[PDB]
C-alpha cells in the first residue's frame, strides 16, 4: 500500500509565511563556552571598577611618577 516517503513540497512557502526570523545583535552579551577562567576575573573586573573618575586620575598620577614600562612590550 505504497504511501510516499518525503516531499519537501510547500516547506519553503510555510517558512516565509510567519518569517524564519533572525534574532539579535545583542548589546547585552551572551556567553557559554568561555573557558570558565576568563569568566571568574570578568566578574572581578566589573566589581573592582567601583566608579571611577577619581580612580583613573590617581593611577594616571602613579604612571607619571613611575614611568613605568619600556620593558613589558618587548618581552
Amino acid at each position: 500500500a505504497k504511501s510516499k516517503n518525503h516531499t519537501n513540497h510547500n516547506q519553503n512557502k510555510k517558512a516565509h509565511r510567519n518569517g524564519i526570523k533572525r534574532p539579535l545583535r545583542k548589546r547585552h552579551e551572551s556567553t557559554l563556552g568561555m573557558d570558565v577562567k576568563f569568566l571568574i576575573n570578568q566578574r572581578y573586573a566589573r566589581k573592582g571598577n567601583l566608579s571611577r573618575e577619581e580612580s583613573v586620575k590617581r593611577y594616571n598620577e602613579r604612571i607619571a611618577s613611575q614611568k613605568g614600562k619600556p620593558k613589558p612590550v618587548t618581552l
Binding site: 516547506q11 510555510k14 517558512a15 524564519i20 534574532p23 551572551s30 563556552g33
Partner: protein, 158 residues
Amino acid sequence: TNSKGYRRGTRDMFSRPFRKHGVIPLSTYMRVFKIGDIVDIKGHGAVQKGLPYKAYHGKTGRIFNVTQHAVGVIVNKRVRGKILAKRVNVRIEHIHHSKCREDFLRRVKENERLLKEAKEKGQWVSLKRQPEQPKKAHFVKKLEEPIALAPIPYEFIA
C-alpha cells in the same frame, strides 16, 4: 532510507585539491583571531581534530569564544523553520578571516578622508556608494578611420 552520518558526501568537501598537498603550513595559526571578527569556515580534511560538520563549510560566523586551541564561531543556520544559532568549536586550521569585514573598515577611513577633503573644499561630500548608472554623451572620433564592416553567416561546416 537516507544518507546520515556526519561525513555524508564529503569526498570533495575534505579533498585537498591538486598541488596543495600535505601539512597545513604555519601562517594559518599566525593570524590572530579576536572575538567579534567575521570568519569563514573552510573544511581542511587533513586536520581531523576540530572538524566543521559538513553544513558549516562556507557558512560564515562571528567569533564569540577563543579557547586554547579552538575558535567558537556562531554560524546562523536555516532550519525547518526557525533560524537557531549554533556555537561550533572549530580549529584555525579550518578557520580563515573573512575580508568581508575589511571592506567596511576601508570605507570608514575613506569616508573620513572624503569628508575632510570636502569640508576643506567647503562643499560637497556625497561619499555614499552609487552603483554604475547609464553613463554619458559619448563622442567617437574616427581618428584612425571610419567603421563599417557588417557580419555573418556561412556557418555550415559540420
